Amino acid sequence: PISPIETVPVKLKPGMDGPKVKQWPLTEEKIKALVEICTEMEKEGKISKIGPENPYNTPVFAIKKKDSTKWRKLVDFRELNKRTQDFWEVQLGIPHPAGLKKKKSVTVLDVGDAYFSVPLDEDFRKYTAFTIPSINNETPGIRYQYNVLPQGWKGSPAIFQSSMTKILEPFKKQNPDIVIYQYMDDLYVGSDLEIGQHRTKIEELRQHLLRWGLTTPDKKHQKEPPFLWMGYELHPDKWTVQPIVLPEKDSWTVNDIQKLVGKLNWASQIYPGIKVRQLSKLLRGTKALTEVIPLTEEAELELAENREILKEPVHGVYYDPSKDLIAEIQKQGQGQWTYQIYQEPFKNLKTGKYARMRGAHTNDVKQLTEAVQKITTESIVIWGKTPKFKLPIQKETWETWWTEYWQATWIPEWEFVNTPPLVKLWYQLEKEPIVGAETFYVDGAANRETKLGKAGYVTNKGRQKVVPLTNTTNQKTELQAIYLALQDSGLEVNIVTNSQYALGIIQAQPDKSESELVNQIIEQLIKKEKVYLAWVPAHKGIGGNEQVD
Amino acid sequence: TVPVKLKPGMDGPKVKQWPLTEEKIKALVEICTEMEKEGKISKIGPENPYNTPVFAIKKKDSTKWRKLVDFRELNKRTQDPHPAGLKKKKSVTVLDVGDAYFSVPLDEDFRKYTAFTIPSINNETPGIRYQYNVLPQGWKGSPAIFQSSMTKILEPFKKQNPDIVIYQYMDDLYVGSDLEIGQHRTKIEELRQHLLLHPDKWTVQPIVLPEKDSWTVNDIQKLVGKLNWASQIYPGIKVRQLCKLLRGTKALTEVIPLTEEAELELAENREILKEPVHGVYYDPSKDLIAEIQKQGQGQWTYQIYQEPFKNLKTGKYARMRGAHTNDVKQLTEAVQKITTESIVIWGKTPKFKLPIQKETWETWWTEYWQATWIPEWEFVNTPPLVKLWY
DNA sequence: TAATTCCCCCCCTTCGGTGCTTTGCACCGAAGGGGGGGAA
Ligand SMILES: [Mg+2]
Ligand SMILES: [Mg+2]
Ligand SMILES: [Mg+2]
């Protein structure tokens, strides 16, 4: 029946009461699925019958289980969840098959009726009351209260997870050679014992679980490979994702694109080279959830490439603690990176991608460093150690960047791999003024009220220009003024500015930015073979800045 | 048992736990298992909504792991003197009195806030949650309770060498006695069985101007900007009589001025620059802010102040050349050194403005931390104001 | 017309905090919205 495990004390927030939401009418099919379920659990003491002494109520309904023949009973505990005290979640992440070591024998078990086998605090049970809406004589409906953990309650997952750990602890304290992966009520049991001894000790585990009230039905007891575990197919020496089906639609709505992108981020954990940026670019604009977006040519090629990749079968491999993890990174382009973590060449532990664009202004080196950080954190999560990187950036370029950059940057041990395209910096700022080149004193200022401004430059050789900017800003006026100097000068320029904002934007060597003005500035800087940028304060009457301003 | 209450109107810490490495997880499991064995901690369930991060560190010449719990949010909401001449000594020494708190039980009503979660590799098991039963480490309330016996347990050694001005902060004792190096080790060795740095060479870095003869237009511009920026810090900088010299649309490399009144003005500014800025008094009520800048080849510059441009202390930390490519290690060592200096001088841990991205610091700072306490920090983004503090 | 919960990942959008450009831009980090994945 139910477990003899102790009940976790649960209380409500101070000055609150239980829900009193009247049950909504249910369709004829779902009442017969509920009276059956309630009759079955009422005999076992899982739910008890109550009378007029309990005023609280909560709606109930039912969905179809993954078996597609049995019904799952749920209670809409949203109000009670609002008035229920807070819990700390003990589930910290999803186990990954790449973190699994090769085991001689493996068995996957599922506890039958996991929540219904764990008792619930007595002084809380009255808040879990509900009514079954028989649709015969409209009334009377029969009223029950839960005696076990109900599905739909916010505290049920945390309570169950911490209760199942206490049940598995006595078994694990005396079987250190057995590895038990516990997710909810799903158990993956691995051992190096032979098949006979493994099965014999598995039967000991199933007896230990049954002694604690948790049954393990034989229909959910897996004994032969491939094992369907946590969305993966586990063979003796490899693992794959369960088959992923992509929609084949001639007209894509916002939701369909959203579904397709989600199914590609999931497929990218083992398939290499999955690109989704073009597909996700159609989701910009808050276009409802039914609006039909035609596929652009740039977003069609990415879809064709992603469909080609998924045609071939791709397998993973298991972890080997003795060897070392090697992570290799490639630049796809437009701020997209792919990475493969493996131990042997062409045998990937896991593949992934990184396409985040942090900050308005950034270059290749910062994105590579962020990708390295993400891979390091993920590897620490999975394998508990930092891998060794094969980066496409040269040691000279990284040395120059980290010596010249004003912020503390560091990446773990890595080696250079000659994989085109290579990460590089497209221009550098001179540390000293250029002798023989024209010196430009540039300045811009925009009115605060009507948002009209003037930006211009003056040269030491007798060449000044002003262009009035409409619908502008004080800082963007400075950016335009700097851009003006680059446009009408030679291959070598000395440039003197006045704004700290332009200094901070420029001297970080950005390559791409969210604004077109900075992109044009970067292009002009790229075609300039020597540039110097110096800052002078404002309103000090400094020589040179007066003529432009 | 001292009843401890939170700040009026505050709640408990609810911080998540960052991922840890395999060695750290194993060490944490062993340590928590033993402290549960003699009842320093107790297992708890999810009905406790409070949580603080935890990890493990290796201290100097110990090779054994030590548990470090991040009681930073709990300290800010707990709501419970400095040695006047601790810096007057020359050989202050740090002692780790951290296991003495495990003998005073924590009050029952407060234990729920001292909860932490140990994760697992590859998430093979839900994280195991524990709560403290005795006075923890890293909590700003443990010294406040242990003091009533901490005084009685040092009273003997306090009348033996009357030259010992001591301090107890967080989990460490700063002992300062103005004596020779030979006597101090014997004095320290006496102290440890009784229970069983360099605070006089810290010099500020004055603001300086470049020295040369050929002052180019760019050089004059940089010097004028430096003087204008420093005028806020040092009242008296006029820079007017030099700004009146740079007149015209001259090129960026012409050395025009050489010998005029500009030399006298530069000398006048140089003379007033070598002063210890009168004022800048330490108010024992405002928060201490320490800002750190990276100046190239393994050099960092730190400024500790309460309000801007009024620097309580300025300094440079070099440690070693750029041989350590590990910028995070150098930054961590600098942070620890600055924190130790602040506790020695002012007795209050500052608030740091680290010049590093959040992800890099949060990923790598645990690998090199070696101190029992943790300072509060934020992350800046000040592209070069063009030297200035060098 | 079905309606719930809890975790992990992704992308996009709003909005508040902070600092300098200073009372208004520029930027960044949390929270929410959708979508995948896992379980009850
Ligand atoms: Mg089950
Ligand atoms: Mg299950
Ligand atoms: Mg299942």
SS (H, E, C) A433-445: CCCCCEEEEEEEE
In angstroms, the separation between the Cα of residue A235 and the nearest Cα of chain B is 19
Find the CB nearest A460 among B21, B45, B251.
B251
Q: How many of the other CB atoms lie within 10 Å of CB of B186?
A: 12
Asked whether the beta carbons of A145 and A48 are under 8 A apart, the reply is yes
Query: Distance (Å) from CA A519 to C1' C17?
Result: 28
Alpha-carbon distance of B38 to B105, in angstroms, equals 13
Angle, alpha carbons A43-A48-A54 (nearest 5°): 165
Residues 436-455 of A with CB under 8 A from B: 439, 441
A493 phi, psi to nearest 5 deg: -135, 140
* Annotated binding-site residue numbers of B: 96, 171-172
Query: Of the candidates A408, A494, A542, which has its C-beta nearest B243's C-beta?
Result: A542
Summarize chain B as % helix, strand, coil (round to 5). Answer: 30, 20, 50
- Token pair 């078996």: residue: A67
Taking the centre of ligand 1 as the mean of its atom positions, its distance from the CA of residue A111, in whole angstroms, is 4
Write out the residue limits of the CATH 3.10.10.10 domain(s) in chain B: 22-195
How far is A165 from A170, CA to CA, in rounded Å? Answer: 9
Cα(B257)–Cα(B62) distance, integer angstroms: 62
User: From the CB of residue B127, how many other CB atoms can be counted at a distance below 10 Å?
Assistant: 21
Report how this structure was experimentally obtained.
Answer: cryo-EM
Return the half-sphere exposure (C-beta side, CA atoms, 13 A cut-off) of residue A100: 30
Of B48, B216, B294, the CB nearest to A406: B294
A72 touches strand C (CB under 7 A): yes
Residues 370-389 on B with a CB inside 8 Å of A are 381-386
List CB-based neighbours of ion ligand 1 within 5 Å. A 110-111, 114, 185
Closest-lying nucleotide for A502 based on CA to C1': C21
* Chain C bases closer than 7 A to any CB of the protein: 1-14, 20-22, 24-30, 34-40
- The domains of chain A, with CATH numbers, are 254-311 (3.30.70.270), 326-416 (3.30.70.270), 438-548 (3.30.420.10)
Instruction: Tell me what percent of chain A is helix, strand and coil, each rounded to the nearest 5.
Output: 30, 25, 45
Return the closest nucleotide (C1') to the Cα of A261.
Answer: C35
| CA neighbours closer than 13 Å in the CB half-sphere of residue A503 | 17
SS (H, E, C) A444-501: EEECCCCCEEEEEEEECCCEEEEEEEECCCHHHHHHHHHHHHHHCCCCEEEEEECCHH
A468 and A457 Cβ atoms separated by less than 8 Å: no
Shortest Cα–Cα distance, B44 to chain A (Å) = 9
Which residue out of A410, A492, A497, A503 would a mutagenesis test of the B interface target, given it has the greatest number of B Cβ atoms within 10 Å? A410
- Cβ atoms within 10 A of the Cβ of B68, count? 23
Closest CA to A270 of A419, A389, A390, A98: A98
Strand C contact residues in chain A (309-328), C-beta within 7 Å: none
In the chain, the amino acid numbered A380 is I
Q: What are the start-end ranges of the H helices in B71-216?
A: 72-76, 142-150, 155-158, 181-195
Between the CA of A211 and the centroid of ligand 2 the distance, in Å, is: 19
CATH number of B217-273: 3.30.70.270
B383/A406 touch (CB, cutoff 8 Å), yes or no: yes
Residue B315 neighbours by CB under 8 Å, 6+ apart: B202, B203, B204, B205, B301, B302, B303, B338, B341
Resolution in A: 2.8
Is residue A382 within 8 angstroms of chain B, CB to CB? yes
Q: Which residue is nearest to nucleotide C14 (CA to C1')?
A: A286
Helix axes of B217-233 and B261-273: crossing angle, nearest 10 degrees: 40
CA distance A51 to chain B (A): 30
Instruction: Sheet containing A227-229: give its strands across.
Output: A227-229, A232-234, A239-241
Contact A535, B218 (CB under 8 A): no
**C-alpha separations of A389 from A8, A317, A349, A501, B281 in Å:** 46, 19, 14, 35, 50
**Alpha-carbon gap, residue A416 to A394, rounded angstroms:** 6
- List A residues 157-176 in contact with B (Cβ-Cβ < 8 A): 158-159, 161-162, 165
> Nearest CA to B305 among B324, B292, B318?
B292
How close, in Å, is residue A157 to chain B by CA atoms?
10
Cβ neighbours around B207 below 10 Å, total = 21
Residue type, B202: W
Tell me how far apart the alpha carbons of residues B241 and B265 are, in angstroms, rounded to a whole number: 7
Total residues belonging to chain A: 549
Helix (H, G, I), strand (E, B) or coil at A48: strand
Residue B259's identity, in one-letter code, is T
User: Which residues of chain B form CATH 3.30.70.270?
Assistant: 217-273, 289-379
DSSP three-state, residue B56: strand
Q: How far is the CA of A299 from the C1' of C37 (A)?
A: 24
CA distance A499 to B285: 36
Tell me the C-alpha distance between A203 and A219, whole Å: 15
Contact B133, B122 (CB under 8 A): no
Asked if residue A98 lies in contact with residue A319, where contact means CB atoms within 8 angstroms, the answer is: yes
Neighbours of A305 (CB within 10 A): 14
Residue B290 CA to residue A506 CA, distance in Å, equals: 27
CB atoms within 10 A of CB A399: 12
Identify the residue whose tokens are 């599922």.
A110
Nearest to B48 among A88, A181, A408 (CB): A88
Separation between Cα atoms, residue B312 and residue B280, nearest integer Å = 6
What letter represents residue B121's amino acid? Answer: I
Q: Which nucleotide is nearest to A113 (CA to C1')?
A: C40
Question: Phi, psi (5° rounding) for residue B33?
Answer: -60, -45
* Assigned token pair, A88: 């700390």
Residues 98-127/A with CB within 7 Å of nucleic chain C are 110, 113-116
**Residues B21/B22/B24/B30 CA torsion (nearest 10 deg):** 160
DSSP notation for A254-284: HHHHHHHHHHHHHHTTTSTT---HHHHGGGT
Q: Is B210 on the interface with A (CB under 8 A)?
A: no
Chain B residues 275-304 within an 8 A CB cutoff of chain A: 293-294, 296-297
The identity of residue A111, as a single letter, is V
Which fold is adopted by the domain B289-379?
Alpha-Beta Plaits (3.30.70)
Instruction: Give A532's contacts in chain B (Cβ within 8 Å).
Output: 252
Q: CA nearest A244: which of A275, A271, A273? A: A271
Q: In what order do the strands lie in the sheet with A452-459?
A: A463-470, A452-459, A438-446, A492-497, A530-535
Distance CA B298, CA B316 (A): 11
Domain B22-195 has CATH 3.40.50.300: no
Please answer yes or no on whether A383 and B22 come within 8 Å at the CB atom: yes
Question: Which positions in chain A touch B250 (Cβ < 8 Å)?
Answer: 439, 460, 543-544
Distance A243 CA to C37 C1' (A): 13
Distance CA A442, CA B63 (A): 59
Nearest residue for C34, CA–C1': A258
